[PDB]
């Protein structure tokens, strides 16, 4: 069926794009977990506590003050990145129910 064989070719895309998003969405979730637990661990430290950050290949000695700023930012940007992936999935989600009812109508 030409008219519907094309309808399924698009949904083969939608359902596949939905996979990339949820996979990335799990990554961000666990990243957020790791960031949060790290933050609450640093908060328990004296301001004078000596903390070490990893900058890619390197390791720089930063401070509780700086560390807690960076960590608070990371978390929030990570949560927003998580809401983006919720919208990202909700739009492909509904665009799938619309392709599902438009195939059944043919």
């Amino acid at each position: 069926p030409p008219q519907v064989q094309a309808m399924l070719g698009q949904l083969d895309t939608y359902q596949q794009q939905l996979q990339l998003v949820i996979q990335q969405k799990q990554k961000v979730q666990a990243d957020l977990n790791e960031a949060k637990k790290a933050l609450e661990e640093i908060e328990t430290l004296p301001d004078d506590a000596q903390i070490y950050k990893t900058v890619g290949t390197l390791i720089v000695k930063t401070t509780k003050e700086k560390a807690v700023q960076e960590l608070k930012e990371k978390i929030e940007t990570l949560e927003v990145r998580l809401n983006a992936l919720n919208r990202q999935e909700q739009k492909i989600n509904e665009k799938v129910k619309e392709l599902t009812q438009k195939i059944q109508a043919a």
Binding site: D31, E34, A35, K37, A38, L39, E41, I42, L45, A49, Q50, I51, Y52, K53, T54, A67, L71, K74
Partner: protein, 148 residues
């Protein structure tokens, strides 16, 4: 007779499916008890370091294939422990050991979870090879008969 063999095959089929979904649980349980064993050894090395009386202890630092360099540990009293997410904090030996024992208990509980799901899966196999061994028994009797 072919409707009784499809029910006796559905149990023997869910056996390889539930015993495969339990092959993954044995895999993840081998990882946990290993990471925990590593943590216990990093704690082991710290508790012993607390015991070595020596001022600034001389050591051999392993750099690869049977290769070592000559060094000395300058702050025997503190340790940089990873807090996670790209960060690690310097702690006193005790604070460090204490934090390690807290992560050592996080592993201790992940093991239980995975060891308990691996438990109920050995339960769903025991009761499936039990429902099917009974379906095979009532199948060899509907056939059997004392002769003449």
């Amino acid at each position: 007779m072919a409707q009784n063999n499809k029910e006796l095959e559905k149990l023997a089929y869910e056996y390889q499916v539930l015993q495969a979904q339990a092959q993954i649980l044995a895999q993840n349980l081998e990882l946990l008890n290993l990471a925990k064993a590593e943590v216990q050894t990093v704690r082991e090395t710290l508790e012993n370091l607390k015991k070595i009386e020596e001022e600034k202890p001389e050591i051999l630092v392993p750099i690869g294939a049977g290769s070592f360099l000559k060094g000395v540990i300058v702050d025997k009293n503190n340790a940089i422990v990873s807090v996670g997410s790209g960060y690690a904090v310097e702690r006193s030996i005790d604070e460090a050991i204490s934090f390690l024992e807290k992560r050592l208990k996080e592993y201790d509980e992940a093991i239980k979870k995975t060891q308990g799901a691996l438990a109920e899966l050995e339960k769903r196999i025991g009761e499936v090879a039990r429902k099917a061994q009974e379906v095979q028994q009532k199948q060899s009797m509907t056939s059997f008969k004392v002769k003449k």
